[PDB]
Curated annotation (Swiss-Prot):
Similarity comment text for this entry: Belongs to the complex I NDUFA2 subunit family.
Cysteine-cysteine disulfides: 10-44
A single MF term (Gene Ontology): NADH dehydrogenase (ubiquinone) activity
The organism of origin for this protein: Homo sapiens
N6-acetyllysine modified-residue sites: 50
Assembly and oligomerization: Complex I is composed of 45 different subunits.
This protein's name: NADH dehydrogenase [ubiquinone] 1 alpha subcomplex subunit 2
Membrane-topology annotation of the record: Peripheral membrane protein
Connected disease: Mitochondrial complex I deficiency, nuclear type 13: A form of mitochondrial complex I deficiency, the most common biochemical signature of mitochondrial disorders, a group of highly heterogeneous conditions characterized by defective oxidative phosphorylation, which collectively affects 1 in 5-10000 live births. Clinical disorders have variable severity, ranging from lethal neonatal disease to adult-onset neurodegenerative disorders.
């Protein structure tokens, strides 16, 4: 629903299991779940799990999604990116 999603990950600061879940368990699944969702796993940048989005709405998103769980992040991605922002 957008131009790009770049998860900035790393292991450095506050992280989550929901994030981790997404990262491992849900990665290939969100890649298939949201076909039109560019998915790049990125490295050390800020705290830890930020959601970079650069939508085709042409808006920015770069945010610590530490508080959200595996499915919910992927669905929230769809929420946000296919038509939240």
């Amino acid at each position: 629903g957008l131009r790009e999603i770049r998860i900035h990950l790393c292991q450095r600061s506050p992280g989550s299991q929901g994030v981790r879940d997404f990262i491992e368990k849900r990665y290939v699944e969100l890649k298939k779940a949201n076909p039109d969702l560019p998915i790049l796993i990125r490295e050390c940048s800020d705290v830890q799990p930020k959601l970079w989005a650069r939508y085709a709405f042409g808006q920015e998103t770069n945010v610590p999604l530490n508080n959200f769980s595996a499915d919910q992040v992927t669905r929230a991605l769809e929420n946000v990116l296919s038509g939240k922002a």
